[PDB]
Amino acid sequence: HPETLVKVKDAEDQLGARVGYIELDLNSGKILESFRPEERFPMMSTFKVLLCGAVLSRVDAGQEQLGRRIHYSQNDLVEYSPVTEKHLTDGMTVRELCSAAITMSDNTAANLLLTTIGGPKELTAFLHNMGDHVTRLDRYYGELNEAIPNDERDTTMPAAMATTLRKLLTGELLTPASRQQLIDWMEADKVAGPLLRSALPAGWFIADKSGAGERGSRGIIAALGPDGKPSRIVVIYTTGSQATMDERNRQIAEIGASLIKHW
């Protein structure tokens, strides 16, 4: 994808930052194009799809129920909890929490779900067991941040994330009902408008999950395709930029425009 590669390198120039990129054939798993595929990037909230995949594996095993209600308190609430802050007395069901984590990127929802699966170390072990020996989650939201140079915690690599997302969405790990639920949550993503969705023509399918973080981090993982059916996985990460969120958004959208134009 010569033009898209040019645009990815342009984005590094514009942002003064690293950009990692991969296009993966959804059906075959073949890497169609990549840039920095085996470099680490902060996952940010894109991990929340993997989290809910682990939750769904427990549901499939009969060890979790999507309808199970979890109660929590003010003390559980961390920064950016737009859905969970509304239900301190209601509690929320496991499916409501995964909906909040994926579609709104609610951080308390993610923490609560992490607890159900045994925490970050257990998510990492889940990933390792499905053949992703790179992606790692280490911390809950709200934990003390060390500010470590080239911090390896809570990171993935574009190729690993793309491969892992394909396994979760189409592989045999989850039941088809659970695969469908996971992609349905991603399709209902509410907070990724200015990224790939902004470049998406009418009639296209997209299921995605966005991320942002300090130090200029911004990213998106997606399954998308024309005619209302996904056919490709796209993963885009950037970190290190001093640019505003708008500027990072625009570069990702422009990579998206290139992806679409040269589909």
Swiss-Prot record:
Catalytic residues of the enzyme? 45, 143
What reactions does this protein catalyze?
Answer: a beta-lactam + H2O = a substituted beta-amino acid
Q: What is the effect of changing residue 214 to K?
A: In TEM-5 and TEM-24
Record keyword Cell membrane present: no
The enzyme class is hydrolase
Question: Record's InterPro entries?
Answer: Beta-lactam/transpept-like (IPR012338), Beta-lactam_cat (IPR045155), Beta-lactam_class-A (IPR000871), Beta-lactam_class-A_AS (IPR023650)
What function is annotated for this protein?
TEM-type are the most prevalent beta-lactamases in enterobacteria; they hydrolyze the beta-lactam bond in susceptible beta-lactam antibiotics, thus conferring resistance to penicillins and cephalosporins. TEM-3 and TEM-4 are capable of hydrolyzing cefotaxime and ceftazidime. TEM-5 is capable of hydrolyzing ceftazidime. TEM-6 is capable of hydrolyzing ceftazidime and aztreonam. TEM-8/CAZ-2, TEM-16/CAZ-7 and TEM-24/CAZ-6 are markedly active against ceftazidime. IRT-4 shows resistance to beta-lactamase inhibitors.
Record-stated family: Belongs to the class-A beta-lactamase family.
Q: What is this protein called?
A: Beta-lactamase TEM
- What does the organism's lineage look like at the top? Bacteria, Pseudomonadati, Pseudomonadota, Gammaproteobacteria, Enterobacterales
> What's the gene?
bla
